[PDB]
Amino acid sequence: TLLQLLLGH
Amino acid sequence: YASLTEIEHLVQSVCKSYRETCQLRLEDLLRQRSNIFSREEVTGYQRKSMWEMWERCAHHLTEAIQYVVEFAKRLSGFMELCQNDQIVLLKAGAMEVVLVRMCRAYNADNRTVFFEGKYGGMELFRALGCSELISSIFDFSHSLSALHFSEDEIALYTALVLINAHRPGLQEKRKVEQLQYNLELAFHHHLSKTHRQSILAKLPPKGKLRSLCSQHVERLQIFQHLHPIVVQAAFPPLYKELFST
Numbered sequence: 001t002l003l004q005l006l007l008g009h
Numbered sequence: 010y011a012s013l014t015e016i017e018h019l020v021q022s023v024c025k026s027y028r029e030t031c032q033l034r035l036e037d038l039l040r041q042r043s044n045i046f047s048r049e050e051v052t053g054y055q056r057k058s059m060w061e062m063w064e065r066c067a068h069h070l071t072e073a074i075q076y077v078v079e080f081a082k083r084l085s086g087f088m089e090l091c092q093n094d095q096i097v098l099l100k101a102g103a104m105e106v107v108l109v110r111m112c113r114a115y116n117a118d119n120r121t122v123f124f125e126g127k128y129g130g131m132e133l134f135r136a137l138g139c140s141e142l143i144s145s146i147f148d149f150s151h152s153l154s155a156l157h158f159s160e161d162e163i164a165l166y167t168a169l170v171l172i173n174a175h176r177p178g179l180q181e182k183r184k185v186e187q188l189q190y191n192l193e194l195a196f197h198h199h200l201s202k203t204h205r206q207s208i209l210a211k212l213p214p215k216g217k218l219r220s221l222c223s224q225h226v227e228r229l230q231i232f233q234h235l236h237p238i239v240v241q242a243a244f245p246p247l248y249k250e251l252f253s254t
C-alpha cells in the first residue's frame with residue numbers, strides 16, 4: 001500500500 | 010518497567026518528534042489571526058463547484074496527513090512495531106491526529122480556521138454540502154481551544170491518539186499496550202510537573218474523534234458515488250487509500 005511505501009517497506 | 014529517567018527521556022523524545030513534524034509553527038498561525046477572508050472572498054468559495062472544493066480540501070488534508078506519517082516514523086517505539094500494526098494504527102489514527110492538531114489553526118474568538126492563507130468561518134465550506142460534519146469539526150476545535158494546549162501537550166496527547174492499543178486488527182496487541190502505557194506515563198508525568206493534570210477529565214471522549222472520522226468516511230462515500238471520476242483523476246491517492254470505501 002501507499003502507507004507501507006511512506007513508512008519505508 | 011520504565012524508570013522515571015526513561016519516562017522523562019520519553020517526554021523529551023515525543024516533544025522533539027512533534028516539533029520536527031508540526032507542519033506550521035504556532036507563531037505563524039497566531040500572527041495570521043488578523044487576516045480574515047472578506048465577504049466577497051467567502052462568496053467566491055461558496056460559489057465554487059462541489060468538486061473543486063472537495064479537491065482542494067482533500068489536498069490540504071493529505072498534506073497534513075503526510076506530516077502525521079512523518080511524526081509516526083520519528084515517534085519512539087512506533088517503528089519497532091510490526092508492519093501490520095504500523096498500518097493499522099496510522100489508517101485509524103492519521104485523521105484523528107490531524108483533527109487534534111487543527112485546533113492550533115482555530116481562532117475561538119471569531120470561530121474561524123486557517124485555510125488557504127486566511128481565516129474563514131464554517132460558511133467558507135458551504136459548497137462541500139456537509140454542514141453537519143463541518144459544524145461538528147468546528148465544535149470539536151472550539152472545545153479543544155478552551156483547554157489552551159501547549160505544544161508539548163499536543164505532542165504527548167497526539168502520540169496517545171496514535172498509539173491506541175484498542176484499534177481492531179492489531180497483531181501484537183501487548184507490544185502496543187506497553188508503548189501506549191509508557192506514553193501515558195510520559196503524558197501524566199509532564200502534566201503533573203506543570204500543574205496541568207486537570208485537563209485529563211476535560212479531554213474529549215474517544216467516541217468523539219471516532220465519530221468525526223466515521224462521518225468523514227461516510228460523507229466521502231456520498232461524494233465519491235456521485236463524482237467517481239473526480240476522485241480517480243484529481244484526489245491524492247493516499248487520501249483515497251485511507252478513506253475511500
Ligand SMILES: CCS(=O)(=O)c1ccc(CNC(=O)c2cnc3c(c2)CN(C[C@H]2CC[C@H](C(F)(F)F)CC2)[C@H]3C(C)C)nc1
Pocket residue numbers: 031032033034063066069070073107110111112113114122123124125134137139142143146147224225226228229
Ligand atoms: C494540522 C497541522 S497545522 O500546522 O496546525 C495546520 C493547520 C491548518 C493548515 C491549513 N488549513 C488546512 O489544512 C485545513 C483547514 N480547515 C479544513 C481543512 C484543511 C479541510 N477541512 C474541510 C474538510 C473536512 C472533511 C470533509 C468531509 F468529511 F466531508 F470529507 C471535507 C472537507 C476544513 C476543516 C473544517 C477541518 N495548515 C497547517
